[PDB]
Structures are given as structure tokens and as C-alpha cells.
């Protein structure tokens, strides 16, 4: 079909969002990641002991191995995954591509194994950063975009509730008002953009913020200057060394945080900033430092209050308030 949509649901505390997709003859839940250009899956090649409890892909009659191709992805916490590659049919809510490069996991870390609801990743960043070697592969969106009514996909992640991913069109029932666009910087392979300004509570700043829209990241990661400024507004807040971030009394009042895009305000309700309970009557904040990254990451904490349009023409990023 020229258009299609899929339901996406969050795991506990909105840590990640999983979306069902069909790969070959199998159906499994993958993490749609606009910060990655790889589509990898738990498979029949993954050790039985490592895929226990997971839905997985078994390369069948429609699979065509890309002989000699390998892939490997490493994460901050140390988690990793790697394996080989096959081309096969991938279908996302009616939109499919018959020969999508599917990266089969031959090994994954204990963290991945323990996260039984997560059976892989479906990268939505630019193909320029796909990790397959010796020759990188095209992402799903890159393969199907010309066949869509419009070369775009949109995301409306939600807090503790079902959300959606739209391909080839925007769904007017998911947002209010009109969509406001801003130019995208894909030089690093990400959906990079620059917010014109921001505001902590009712205190606005005329300074811009440059970063990327990443559905695969849990929190809203900003510059220390801004993170420190935000928690200065939260009574009892403090940096918890053992938690690796700012925490505060679970009952503390949290101000909203918004960023300005053109004439539109993308507001993160203070409610979403109270991320997770860490015991002792303390809560871990949804806003944390982007230290080490070099730039800001507009992750799920931020995205789940917005309807975001990823437009390949430009490219550009659009924002609108969720209905
Ligand atoms: C994708 O979405 C378009 C626009 O709503 C539909 O016309 C099509 O049938 C498919 O559901």
C-alpha cells in the first residue's frame, strides 16, 4: 500500500517502544529507532539460550543471504549485538519491501536476552550510517519511500499507552492544529535539527538547541547548563551518583520544559519529567545530561508529547501537539 500505520506500545516507565512487524514469514516486535540505520532481529541463528522467550526470525524460502556481510552494534552500557545478513520481505502496517536487508543476530548481550518483549531494531535514520560491512545496506524507509503517497513517516509515541507510526501520510486525528517544519541536518546520518529557543517553566531563553530526534533514546538529553538550570527549579533535586543522574523527592513539583520551533511550542509536561521511582521516596528525572555525546538528544521523554513528521524531502522535521 502507498500508506500504512502501525501501533507502538511502551514498556515499563516508557523505557522503550515496541512495534510488531513481519520479517519473512515471522512476526516479531521491534524497536523503531530514528537514531539507527540498521534493522536487526533475534533469529534462528541466535543461540537458543540467548533467544529464549523471544519471537524470532527464521530465514526461509524467501530469504536471500548476502554472503560475506556482517554487522555489529555496540551500546553505551556495554550491550552489543552482531551477526550476518539476509534480504527478505519486511512488512510494516501494509507497507512492504520484498528484499529488505535483515541483519540476523548470531549473538546478543544478556540485557537483550532479558528484554523478552524486544526482538530487534528497525532503524529509521539515514542509510549513510548503516553498519553492515563490507557494503552498507539501505534502510526500510529508504527502500519504500518512493512507493509512498508522500516520502514521509510520522511518530506519535504516548505515555503509558498505545501510540502510532504513520508511513506515507499524516493522520489528522492524532494531532491538533497545523504541522510546523524545520530543516534537517543529516550530515551525521541522524534526523538532526535546531530548536529556535526553549523555556524552563515560564522562563524562556532566546538560545537555540541543536540535537537529533531519536525514538530509540529514552530520555531528553541536554547541555549541562540547561539540565542544571532545570533542576535548580526543582526543590530537593540533586545529582545521584549511584543512579547516574538527577533525582528528586517523588512529590516534588516539576516545571514543564518546552522548545520553540518556528511559531510552535513543543511542550514536555512536568508529569513526563518524573521518569522512574528509584526508591527511598526519590524519582529519577526525565531530563538528563548529554555529556559525552556532544549534542542533544530529543528522546522518548520529549517525543511522547508530540506528533513528529520525518520528511525525506528537504529533509525536514515537522511538529504538532498530540490530540
Ligand atoms: C494509508 O493511508 C491512506 C490515507 O488515510 C489510505 O487512503 C490508505 O488506504 C492507507 O490506509
d(CA 96, CA 205): 44
In 123-212, which ranges are continuous DSSP H helix?
Answer: 140-144
Enter the C-alpha cell of residue 244: 547516574
Residues 96 and 187 in one domain: no
Residue 1 counted as domain residue: no
Residues 140 and 164 in one domain: yes
Residues 176 and 301 in one domain: yes
**Closest Cα to atom 8 of ligand 1:** 3
User: Taking Cα atoms as reference points, which of 267, 235, 303 lies closest to residue 33?
Assistant: 303
Residues designated catalytic: 33, 214
Identify the domain boundary among 170, 194, 228: 170
User: Taking Cα atoms as reference points, which of 291, 201, 289 lies closest to residue 239?
Assistant: 289
Phi-psi region of 223 (alpha: psi -120 to 50; beta: other; left: phi over 0): beta
d(CA 31, CA 278): 25
In the chain, which ranges are continuous DSSP H helix?
Answer: 48-51, 110-114, 140-144, 224-231, 270-273, 300-303
Residues 153 and 23 in one domain: yes
Q: Residues near 52 by Cβ (< 8 Å), separated by ≥ 6?
A: 113
By residue range, what is the domain housing residue 190?
Answer: 171-322
Identify the domain boundary among 120, 137, 170: 170
d(CA 262, CA 176): 16
Residues 183 and 318 in one domain: yes
Residues 158 and 19 in one domain: yes
Q: Degrees (nearest 5) of the Cα angle 276, 281, 286? A: 25
How far away, in angstroms, is 166 Cα from ligand 1 center? 10
Residue with cell 540467548: 50
Ligand 1 atom nearest to CA at 4: 1
What's the length of the chain?
323
Q: Is any atom of ligand 1 closer than 6 Å to the C-beta of 150?
A: no
User: Taking Cα atoms as reference points, which of 156, 153, 150 lies closest to residue 175?
Assistant: 156
Contact 102/139 with Cβ under 8 angstroms? no
What's the number of domains the chain is made of?
A: 2
d(CA 235, CA 249): 8
User: Taking Cα atoms as reference points, which of 294, 298, 275 lies closest to residue 224?
Assistant: 294
User: Taking Cα atoms as reference points, which of 34, 195, 17, 60 lies closest to residue 129?
Assistant: 34
Residues 85 and 45 in one domain: yes
Residues 150 and 208 in one domain: no
Pocket test for ligand 1, best of 169, 170, 172 (most atoms within 8 A of CB): 169
Residues 219 and 132 in one domain: no
Q: Is any atom of ligand 1 closer than 6 Å to the C-beta of 171?
A: no
Residue 138 counted as domain residue: yes
d(CA 222, CA 149): 35
d(CA 272, CA 287): 9
Share in percent of the chain as helix, strand, coil (round to 5): 10, 50, 40
Enter the C-alpha cell of residue 198: 526553549
d(CA 148, CA 62): 23
Dihedral (C-alpha) 27, 28, 34, 38: value to the nearest 10 degrees? -90
**Closest Cα to atom 7 of ligand 1:** 3
Q: Is any atom of ligand 1 closer than 6 Å to the C-beta of 172?
A: no
CA distances (Å), origin 93, targets 8, 109, 169: 11, 29, 13
d(CA 241, CA 237): 13
CA distances (Å), origin 92, targets 88, 182, 284: 13, 27, 34
How far away, in angstroms, is 2 Cα from ligand 1 center? 7
**Closest Cα to atom 6 of ligand 1:** 3
Residues 166 and 22 in one domain: yes
Residues 44 and 157 in one domain: yes
Q: Residues near 4 by Cβ (< 8 Å), separated by ≥ 6?
A: 92, 93, 94, 95, 166, 167, 168
Query: Nominal resolution in Å?
Result: 1.9
Residue 133 counted as domain residue: yes
Contact 266/179 with Cβ under 8 angstroms? no
Q: Residue 53, class by beta-carbon neighbours within 10 Å (0-12 exposed, 13-18 middle, 19+ buried)?
A: exposed
What is the CATH number for 106? 2.40.70.10
Residues 192 and 207 in one domain: yes
Contact 37/123 with Cβ under 8 angstroms? yes
Q: Is any atom of ligand 1 closer than 6 Å to the C-beta of 93?
A: no
Residues closing a segment before a gap in the chain (C–N exceeding 2.5 Å): none
Residue 209 counted as domain residue: yes
**Closest Cα to atom 10 of ligand 1:** 3
User: What's the chain's Rg over C-alpha atoms?
Assistant: 20
Residue 207 three-state SS: coil
Determination technique used: X-ray
d(CA 269, CA 35): 23
Contact 23/56 with Cβ under 8 angstroms? no
Identify the domain boundary among 109, 141, 170: 170
Amino acid at each position: 500500500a502507498a500508506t500504512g500505520s502501525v501501533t507502538t506500545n511502551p514498556t515499563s516507565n516508557d523505557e522503550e517502544y515496541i512495534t510488531q512487524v513481519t520479517v519473512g514469514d515471522d512476526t516479531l516486535g521491534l524497536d523503531f529507532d530514528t537514531g539507527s540505520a540498521d534493522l536487526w532481529v533475534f533469529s534462528s541463528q541466535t543461540p537458543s539460550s540467548e533467544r529464549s522467550g523471544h519471537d524470532y526470525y527464521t530465514p526461509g524460502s524467501s530469504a536471500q543471504k548476502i554472503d560475506g556481510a556482517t554487522w555489529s552494534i555496540s551500546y553505551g552500557d556495554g550491550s552489543s549485538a552482531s551477526g550476518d545478513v539476509y534480504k527478505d520481505k519486511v512488512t510494516v502496517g501494509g507497507v512492504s519491501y520484498d528484499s529488505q536487508a535483515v541483519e540476523s543476530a548470531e549473538k546478543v548481550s544478556s540485557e537483550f536476552t532479558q528484554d523478552t518483549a524486544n526482538d530487534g531494531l528497525l532503524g529509521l535514520a539515514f542509510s549513510s550510517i548503516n553498519t553492515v560491512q563490507p557494503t552498507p545496506q539501505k534502510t526500510f524507509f529508504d527502500n519504500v519511500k518512493s512507493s509512498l503517497s508522500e516520502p514521509i513517516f510520522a511518530v506519535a509515541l504516548k505515555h503509558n499507552a498505545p501510540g502510532v507510526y504513520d508511513f506515507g501520510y499524516t493522520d489528522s486525528s492524532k494531532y491538533t492544529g497545523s504541522i510546523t517544519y524545520t530543516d534537517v541536518d543529516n550530515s551525521q546520518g541522524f534526523w538532526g535539527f535546531t530548536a529556535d529557543g526553549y523555556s524552563i517553566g515560564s522562563d524562556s531563553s532566546s538560545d537555540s538547541i541543536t540535537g537529533i530526534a531519536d525514538t530509540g533514546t529514552t530520555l531528553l538529553l541536554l547541555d549541562d547548563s540547561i539540565v542544571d538550570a532545570y533542576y535548580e527549579q526543582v526543590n530537593g533535586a540533586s545529582y545521584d551518583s549511584s543512579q547516574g543522574g538527577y533525582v528528586f523527592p517523588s512529590s516534588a513539583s516539576l516545571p514543564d520544559f518546552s522548545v520553540t520551533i518556528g511559531d510552535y511550542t513543543a511542550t514536555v509536561p512536568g508529569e513526563y519529567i518524573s521518569f522512574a521511582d528509584v526508591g527511598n521516596g526519590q524519582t529519577f528525572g526525565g531530563i538528563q545530561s548529554n555529556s559525552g555525546i556532544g549534542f542533544s538528544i530529543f528522546g522518548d521523554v520529549f517525543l511522547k508529547s508530540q506528533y513528529v513528521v520525518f520528511d525525506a524531502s528537504g529533509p525536514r522535521l515537522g511538529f504538532a501537539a498530540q490530540a
